[PDB]
Structures are given as C-alpha cells and as structure tokens.
Amino acid sequence: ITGRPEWIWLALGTALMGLGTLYFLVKGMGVSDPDAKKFYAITTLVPAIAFTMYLSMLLGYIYWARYASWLFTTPLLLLDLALLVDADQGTILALVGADGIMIGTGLVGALTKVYSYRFVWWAISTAAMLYILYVLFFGFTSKAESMRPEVASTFKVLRNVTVVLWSAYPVVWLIGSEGAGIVPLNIETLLFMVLDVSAKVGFGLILLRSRAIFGE
Numbered sequence: 022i023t024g025r026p027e028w029i030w031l032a033l034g035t036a037l038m039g040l041g042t043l044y045f046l047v048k049g050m051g052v053s054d055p056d057a058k059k060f061y062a063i064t065t066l067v068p069a070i071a072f073t074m075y076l077s078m079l080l081g082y083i084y085w086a087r088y089a090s091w092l093f094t095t096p097l098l099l100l101d102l103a104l105l106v107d108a109d110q111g112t113i114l115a116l117v118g119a120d121g122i123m124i125g126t127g128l129v130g131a132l133t134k135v136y137s138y139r140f141v142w143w144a145i146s147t148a149a150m151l152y153i154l155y156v157l158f159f160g161f162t163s164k165a166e167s168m169r170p171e172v173a174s175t176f177k178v179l180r181n182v183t184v185v186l187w188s189a190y191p192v193v194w195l196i197g198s199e200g201a202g203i204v205p206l207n208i209e210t211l212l213f214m215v216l217d218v219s220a221k222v223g224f225g226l227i228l229l230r231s232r233a234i235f236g237e
C-alpha cells in the first residue's frame with residue numbers, strides 16, 4: 022500500500038501541512054501585537070484543517086474530504102487578505118458567498134452521473150472563482166495602495182501568488198478524472214497536493230514573515 026503513488030502524495034501532504042502548522046505555532050509564540058495575533062490565528066488554523074483532512078484521507082485509504090477542506094480553508098485565506106486591506110463587510114460577505122458557490126458547484130460537478138454536465142458545473146464554479154480573483158486583483162489592490170508601504174508590498178505578492186495558484190485548480194480538475202480524464206489519478210493527486218501546500222503553507226510563510234501584519 023505504501024508503494025502506491027496515491028498513498029505517497031497523501032502522506033507527503035499530511036507531513037507538510039503538519040510541519041507548516043507547527044512552524045506557524047512556533048513563530049506566533051511571543052508575538053503580542055493584537056493585529057499580528059489575528060493573522061497568526063487564521064494562518065495557523067488553515068494548514069491545521071488541511072492536515073486533519075489529509076490525515077483522514079490516509080486513514081480512509083475518499084476524496085470527499087478534499088472539497089470539505091477547501092470549503093473551510095478558502096474562506097479563511099480570503100479573510101486573511103480582507104484583514105490585510107481592511108476590506109468592507111459587504112465585500113467580504115460577497116467573496117465568501119461566491120466562494121461557497123465555487124466549492125459547492127465543484128462538488129456537484131464531481132458527483133454528476135452524466136457527461137457534458139460535468140463541464141456545466143465546472144463553468145459555474147470557474148465563474149465564481151473569476152469574480153473572487155477580479156475583486157482581489159482590481160478591488161483589493163486599490164485599497165492596499167492607499168495603505169502603508171509594507172502592506173501594499175506584501176498584499177501584491179500574496180495577491181499574485183493567490184491568483185496563479187487558485188487559477189490552476191480548474192485546469193487540474195478539467196484534465197483530471199472529474200473532467201476529461203486525461204491525467205491519471207496519482208498525478209492529479211500530486212498536482213492538488215502541491216497546490217494545496219503552496220496556497221496554505223507557502224502563502225502563510227510569505228504573510229507571517231512580513232511586517233505588514235503588525236498594527237504599527
């Protein structure tokens with residue numbers, strides 16, 4: 022069983038999410054700034070949730086826990102960004118709403134019994150994602166630019182990383198088993214794991230290493 026590629030990617034994901042969680046916990050100890058503490062809580066929770074979900078897929082070894090993890094973590098990552106640019110509550114609610122639709126229709130597309138329809142759900146989900154990225158890239162950038170240089174600079178990096186990583190999910194899904202079935206399952210699992218770790222641990226490393234989280 023341990024020789025199967027599928028199991029290996031799940032095991033590596035579990036290890037990387039767990040290590041990232043522990044490292045963020047270590048980095049956060051000592052920090053007393055009220056503002057920085059909020060970022061540490063959110064950013065530490067994200068890989069912790071993914072670790073539990075990745076561990077679950079290992080114990081179950083199934084990918085239902087995948088969408089469950091995305092359902093919880095994507096809105097948290099959005100909160101992280103919203104907090105950095107001090108976004109309005111109305112805009113935050115719209116983002117979370119679109120995010121729920123994105124993950125939700127994504128699951129419906131994975132569960133659909135008939136072909137052709139797989140892409141209908143993928144299209145609706147991708148539209149939801151495009152709205153989110155449009156808000157992050159054009160909307161949030163304006164607010165960040167009117168903020169402290171450290172904040173404007175860090176937001177732009179996180180934004181660029183988020184846009185690229187999130188955009189890769191619909192591509193992988195389409196070429197994977199839920200879509201056209203071009204790429205084998207083990208490769209698709211590898212791709213999603215790499216994206217998950219990069220979007221959570223990588224994203225968190227960039228954010229938490231920055232002075233932009235402090236109130237100052």
Ligand SMILES: *C/C=C(C)/C=C/C=C(C)/C=C/C1=C(C)CCCC1(C)C
Binds near residue numbers: 127190191194
């Ligand atoms: C930690 C995990 C993250 C940041 C996951 C992000 C996932 C997405 C942006 C997923 C998007 C999808 C679509 C746009 C359409 C097809 C189905 C999904 C759910 C794979």
Ligand SMILES: [Br-]
Binds near residue numbers: 217
């Ligand atoms: Br995840």
Ligand SMILES: [Br-]
Binds near residue numbers: 107108
């Ligand atoms: Br806003």
Ligand SMILES: [K+]
Binds near residue numbers: 051052053054
């Ligand atoms: K401090």
